[PDB]
Amino acid sequence: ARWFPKTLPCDVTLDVSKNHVIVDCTDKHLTEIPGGIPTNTTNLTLTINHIPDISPASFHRLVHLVEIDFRCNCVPIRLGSKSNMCPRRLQIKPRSFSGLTYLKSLYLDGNQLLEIPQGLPPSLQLLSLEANNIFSIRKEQLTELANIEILYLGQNCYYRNPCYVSYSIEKDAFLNLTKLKVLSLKDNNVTTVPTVLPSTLTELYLYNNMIAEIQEDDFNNLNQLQILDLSGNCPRCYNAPFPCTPCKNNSPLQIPVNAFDALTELKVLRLHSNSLQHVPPRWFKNINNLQELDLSQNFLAKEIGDAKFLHFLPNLIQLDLSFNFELQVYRASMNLSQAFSSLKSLKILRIRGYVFKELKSFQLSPLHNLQNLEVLDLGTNFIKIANLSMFKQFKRLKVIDLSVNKISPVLEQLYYFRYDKYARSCSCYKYGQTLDLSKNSIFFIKSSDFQHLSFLKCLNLSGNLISQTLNGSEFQPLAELRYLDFSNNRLDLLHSTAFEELRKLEVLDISSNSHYFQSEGITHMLNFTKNLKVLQKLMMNDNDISSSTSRTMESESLRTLEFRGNHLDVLWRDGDNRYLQLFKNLLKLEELDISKNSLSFLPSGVFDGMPPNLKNLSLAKNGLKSFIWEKLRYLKNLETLDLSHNQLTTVPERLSNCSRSLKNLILKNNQIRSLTKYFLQDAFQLRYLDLSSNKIQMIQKTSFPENVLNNLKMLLLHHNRFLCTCDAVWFVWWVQHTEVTIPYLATDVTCVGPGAHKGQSVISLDLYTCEL
Amino acid sequence: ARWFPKTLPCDVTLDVSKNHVIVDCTDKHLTEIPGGIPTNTTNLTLTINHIPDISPASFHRLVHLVEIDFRCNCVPIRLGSKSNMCPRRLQIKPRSFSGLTYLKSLYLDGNQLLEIPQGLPPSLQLLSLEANNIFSIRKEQLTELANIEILYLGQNCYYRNPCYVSYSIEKDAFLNLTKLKVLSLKDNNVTTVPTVLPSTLTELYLYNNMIAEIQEDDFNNLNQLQILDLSGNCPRCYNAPFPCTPCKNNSPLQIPVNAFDALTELKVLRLHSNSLQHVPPRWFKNINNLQELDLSQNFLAKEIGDAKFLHFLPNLIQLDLSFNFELQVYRASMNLSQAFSSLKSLKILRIRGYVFKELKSFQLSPLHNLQNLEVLDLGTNFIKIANLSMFKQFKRLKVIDLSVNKISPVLEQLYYFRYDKYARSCSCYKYGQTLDLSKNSIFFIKSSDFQHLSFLKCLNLSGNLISQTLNGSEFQPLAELRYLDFSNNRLDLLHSTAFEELRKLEVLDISSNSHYFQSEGITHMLNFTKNLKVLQKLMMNDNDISSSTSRTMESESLRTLEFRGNHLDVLWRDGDNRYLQLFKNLLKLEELDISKNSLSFLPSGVFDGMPPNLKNLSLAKNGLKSFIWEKLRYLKNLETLDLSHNQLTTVPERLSNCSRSLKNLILKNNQIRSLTKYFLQDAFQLRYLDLSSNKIQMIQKTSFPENVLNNLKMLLLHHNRFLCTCDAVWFVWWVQHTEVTIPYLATDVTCVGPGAHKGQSVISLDLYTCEL
């Protein structure tokens, strides 16, 4: 099928629409640049290797390189692996780059470089040098970068990569860089805004530094700038999850009231963790197109009750005032200034961490007529009282977020306290209006808790303390609810009428409601499904279900049932036939997850008991020790079988005689040591086969007829125990010359033996002695 | 050191006091009885192997056998391995046993035998035939058992081992067995009490059968009988976790009022799951010494309110009336008859599963003067209301158990609903008065909740819904508390004064209180330890701790800290120095568990930061991939190091040069492929070393100086990758001839290679070709 096998340990792709020849050697444990890289190569990536130097020989023939990604070949000590520390900094010999006439991007982050590499071609638009040891910028070193548009210089002097002195930038160092659009000097121990900056800047990043004061002309020539981030200068350090040194005297970042006058094009302004106590309205008198404003992590609790500066921001789209609370105060209520009413373009307002005991309908009045408002985020506020009906007047909104409060009768999990949200490394919203009350203290629900909330499409009650028998009366006002997340509660299914008032419910999650399922002898009504006539997806994972008063679940609508992390091994105890048709009457069921159910064997009757349209069946992570493959004949619509992470030792003698429908067979992480003689013979339906992480020694051509592999959309073979003797001759040849996609040929499809070939890659193996 | 290496795959013990020479071949994957079993052998066990027949050859030389434990060499289908099914019944050949003149016990449970083995010697006192296929008992087959005292015949006909017919016992089958003391016919499809039984019976087990009626003379001669179990005849089948067939027409087991008249010696009467609606007092008219009575799983809810039979039970020690609730009824209160006051010897009263809404002080008045009462178990009753102060009148009690209720402002978890609690296979009570309120619905605690309870020594609040900031006021009445189990709640350590009112507290568990720790930026006061002046043990496992407002925990008392399942990897993020002395000021700390903390490397400073008396340190299950062994020098009292389940590849060059105190070094489940040349040289303190489950190929004598091996109490080496070539000569010789204790030499110290020897045990290895 191929005349010349590929030996290069890098993925090579063609996008001729883009006349790009892309060679990706990321994370291939290389200690040299490989030989034989195609000469037309456009994008060459060498991230996360251990290549210790660059030379004119490095890219000699790669004439058409537009991009070289050479990140993390010697990463700073405290950011990189301690088990494989870099012994030393990348060595860049002269004129390694001056030949690359078409080079537009050069990434050299995280190599412990000491100076800006010189000799760079004038075609270079982007230069990235983050996480090196360059902490003095000299205008002489920047001359080579005449045509640079994007320059990343951050993380060269901060706590995980210290330089132990102030960052130093020569006067007007960047000013002759007259096409420079983006300059990043974040995380750098910088002490003043460098001046003068080229007026063509659109984005300037100066956050997490040692800039104590802005001066009134620091930005006066930047009339094209659209994004300015000054965050984390004079940081608010209480409960900081990184080492944090505040400005002396509780001082804020001092910004003269006219400092922003020239930034007529500014769209985003970030003043996070600047210890601000006041927001002078004068800042914004000639910023009329501001759309995104971050004032999180300051001391603006008082200012939130006044906030006259809001009157100057009629186009602002999202406003963040999270975590401005006063230390050691538990205010009674949230005092929002009427000025909020002037935020007519506002779509997103976030006020986490204001911290107050009670939310009352009047307190949110300044927002009543903000007509574009879509998201209101009042999470992490320790709110104890909130009458949910007050959202009568917010049907308009997509998300109402009261996550993580104390109420009783998607942003990353660390977001507001992370040191650098934007550091680079080497959900029910779709259904409509969402009310997120996850991780609150709701211990009991009534119907009236939800009056005037009939418009809700998704309600998140995950992670409350609901320890209640539901009898179908608790959710009556929620006539439009399509998604209920009830996970992490203590639902007691005493009554099969539970949830039946949710007439429009399409998705129900009661995962991790194990409490009442873990008790001896208590009634459990798993047949509650029958009353839910449009239910499509039911998640009841990690419930430790081992007993059921009903012997069948029934639904004419349900297509996906996740039953992972239960004890069907107990329910299906050998000798007890009563639950072998637990799922038979889910007539439309298409996906069944019963992974992690301790099923070390499947009793006879399990397969006959499956509903008739089952497509995707996962039995993963069960410790399955045996499997009667013929019983797959019962599953006449089966397309995906996940048997991963078990203890199977054999494949069927003839897969086609087990299922003529099977498309994807996942057998990864088992104990299979050899294949059947005629395994895949006539399995022309098969499109995906994963045999990785087993113990196979040999694969012969009778097990793998190429009329079957010729349709195989991926064939996973890595991490086995291949023996590369003259017996393996057909397998080795076929692997080297095949069209079929086989991941990890460069790095984990290897011989275990004999002796000579141990650790050697199958792709690189020369078996000519077998043909003497 | 040994002249004759032991090669027999069985554990052999000498107890010269008794001459027992005990040969234990349990679960050794044997397919024949091994040869060379000592001829003095008294107790020989062959349980769980696959020996397919017994013959006179089997025990020919074993003259002095007193016991043959030969169970489960062919387990019934539904009870046995589905991956290694038994192909055919054990074959018992004639005169296999009749030579063994001193044989007193013979266990043949679980071999699918069809008849009682004949030819048995008259010395036999115990015969066990459980879980075979013998379901017709004939007097002709029992004549050989003249001197039998103990006979187990159960589980030969039930849902996990069906015989498809009624059990059949010939009239007076057992009557000439004139020394029979124990007869067990449980789980057998028995339909009537076999009669007449020998009057010498002390224990009769008839439970889980099909006996619908007791005849008034069925027990007429058993005046020596001490234990009678008739449970599971006419079972109560609601929510039964096994296939359950009740007697027609809801009928109970019918027991004539004079059925027990002869049982003047009866001490235990079990009538569990007999569907009883009444307990006639006349039953007990001639039983004065009854000590244990099990009336669980019946229909005695009304009778519990009357219960005149209790007046005939002044010697009763234990009473179980659990799970007598009425179907579909939720009674308001528990109506305990005044007769309970006549239970003058009662130590244990269990009334789980009565089901009632509120417990009130007067309802327990019938128990107020039961002077010996030690345990009151009202668990799994769905109690919603309870004034805890009412137990002021139960200060004498050891355990007050309200586990698994709905209260708001040790038996196995398999117990009352298990099919056979006694089926055989092939905690803070010590501190004083305990109030167990675990798994209830308490969401908020105040001081007055515990009024009048100052006598309590242990309180279990595990698994409630307490989502509260404690400030030292909540437990004020509990002045004698020594143990607080607060695990599985939502503790909020906003204040370091939490728990300080518990002045006598010695053990505190706040494990699995991760809720507020998984919230970014929230305050967490880990220095709350300082106020607890007699605190000895602190468990804060699985809290996902990743941040801390305080930088040091402090205690002058604490000796044990379990910190497993947190995120010290985040707290100790490389470059963040602030928490490297988190534990340093726990001055008396001797034991620290920081397993499962995602510590793939240890930052420098961690070891210097440990408190000075640390003795037992666990870094298990961390994904550790490197370890600076020299850093152990800081731990000058380190005696136990657990590095199990990590990714280590190397041991120190000289362990003695790393720690002069280290006694027990656990390295199991790592990636170690070789030992250093002088690994153990001069490690004179070392007494226990676990190198099992690694990838070791070779061990040379220089790593194992034999003056060090001689002080080892145990040296674990099993499950490695040993190479049995002529290079391994010293190791193979030393393993075979050493006195040092090495588990699994018979079963998992094996050659991986070369070719010829693969799978062979090192102990069986003949390397003479290496010495030609």
Ligand SMILES: *[C@@H]1O[C@H](CO)[C@@H](O[C@@H]2O[C@H](CO)[C@@H](O)[C@H](O)[C@H]2NC(C)=O)[C@H](O)[C@H]1NC(C)=O
């Ligand atoms: C940022 O620069 C400051 C100097 O402005 C560094 O502080 C010096 O650090 C050295 C070595 O730690 C001390 O001996 C000096 O006394 C410090 N000087 C001053 C003026 O504080 C600081 O270490 C740098 N921080 C980082 C993260 O690189």
Ligand SMILES: CCOCc1nc2c(N)nc3ccccc3c2[nH]1
């Ligand atoms: C031993 C009791 O077994 C039957 C039973 N199950 C439940 C239950 N899940 N929840 C309940 C809630 C309130 C009252 C009773 C029950 C109940 N009763």
Ligand SMILES: CCOCc1nc2c(N)nc3ccccc3c2[nH]1
């Ligand atoms: C937003 C971060 O401010 C710090 C803070 N932490 C807590 C806390 N753990 N618990 C609390 C309980 C009630 C009120 C406030 C707090 C609180 N505040």
Ligand SMILES: *[C@@H]1O[C@H](CO)[C@@H](O)[C@H](O)[C@H]1NC(C)=O
């Ligand atoms: C390839 O590199 C060029 C030059 O830096 C870059 O603009 C482009 O996005 C990259 N494209 C692909 C497909 O890798």
Ligand SMILES: *[C@@H]1O[C@H](CO)[C@@H](O)[C@H](O)[C@H]1NC(C)=O
């Ligand atoms: C608000 O809360 C109260 C309960 O305190 C309730 O009576 C009332 O009807 C609720 N509804 C609205 C629209 O606020």
Ligand SMILES: *[C@@H]1O[C@H](CO)[C@@H](O)[C@H](O)[C@H]1NC(C)=O
């Ligand atoms: C509900 O919130 C939890 C945690 O706050 C989150 O994990 C889950 O995704 C949410 N549910 C939905 C349906 O998005």
Ligand SMILES: *[C@@H]1O[C@H](CO)[C@@H](O)[C@H](O)[C@H]1NC(C)=O
């Ligand atoms: C369900 O319980 C609710 C709340 O207690 C009550 O309104 C209703 O009467 C109950 N319905 C039924 C059918 O029992």
Ligand SMILES: *[C@@H]1O[C@H](CO)[C@@H](O)[C@H](O)[C@H]1NC(C)=O
């Ligand atoms: C569910 O099953 C139980 C017992 O099997 C029965 O009492 C109840 O009526 C059923 N409810 C349904 C089918 O909705």
Ligand SMILES: *[C@@H]1O[C@H](CO)[C@@H](O)[C@H](O)[C@H]1NC(C)=O
């Ligand atoms: C308790 O129930 C018993 C039995 O039905 C009855 O004799 C008695 O009157 C009841 N007493 C109380 C206080 O409920």
Ligand SMILES: *[C@@H]1O[C@H](CO)[C@@H](O)[C@H](O)[C@H]1NC(C)=O
């Ligand atoms: C509980 O009992 C105590 C002692 O008699 C009493 O003072 C207290 O009021 C009772 N509490 C309640 C909630 O009834």
Ligand SMILES: *[C@@H]1O[C@H](CO)[C@@H](O)[C@H](O)[C@H]1NC(C)=O
């Ligand atoms: C508290 O109860 C839980 C479960 O209810 C149990 O796991 C734990 O052992 C108990 N605590 C003590 C100290 O016995």
Ligand SMILES: *[C@@H]1O[C@H](CO)[C@@H](O)[C@H](O)[C@H]1NC(C)=O
């Ligand atoms: C601590 O909490 C309790 C909660 O009721 C309160 O009585 C007390 O005033 C609080 N403050 C203290 C003890 O300083």
Ligand SMILES: *[C@@H]1O[C@H](CO)[C@@H](O)[C@H](O)[C@H]1NC(C)=O
């Ligand atoms: C505990 O540490 C916190 C954080 O520094 C501090 O505010 C408090 O005073 C300390 N309290 C005690 C009792 O050590």
Ligand SMILES: *[C@@H]1O[C@H](CO)[C@@H](O)[C@H](O)[C@H]1NC(C)=O
């Ligand atoms: C390790 O060896 C060196 C050289 O003999 C010695 O000076 C040092 O004290 C030793 N350390 C320990 C802990 O024995």
